[PDB]
Amino acid sequence: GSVVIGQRCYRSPDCYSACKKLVGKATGKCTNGRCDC
């Protein structure tokens, strides 16, 4: 959906190198210190 992953984050760009490896995902958003792709 939104897909929460293990990678932690302060800002949403922190998530790009992780989320972009998921089919159809790019940056995601940072929420509760986790990447929501």
Instruction: Give the residues across from 4 on adjacent strands.
Output: 36
Q: What is the DSSP string of 5-36?
A: EEEE-SSGGGGHHHHTTSTT--S-EEETTEEE
Resolution of the coordinates, Å: 1.8
Residue 26's φ and ψ, nearest 5 degrees, are -135, -85
What does the angle CA 12 – CA 14 – CA 18 come to, to the nearest 5 degrees? Answer: 105
Question: CA separation (Å) from 12 to 4, 8, 16?
Answer: 13, 10, 8
What is the residue extent of each domain of the chain? 4-36
Exp. method: X-ray
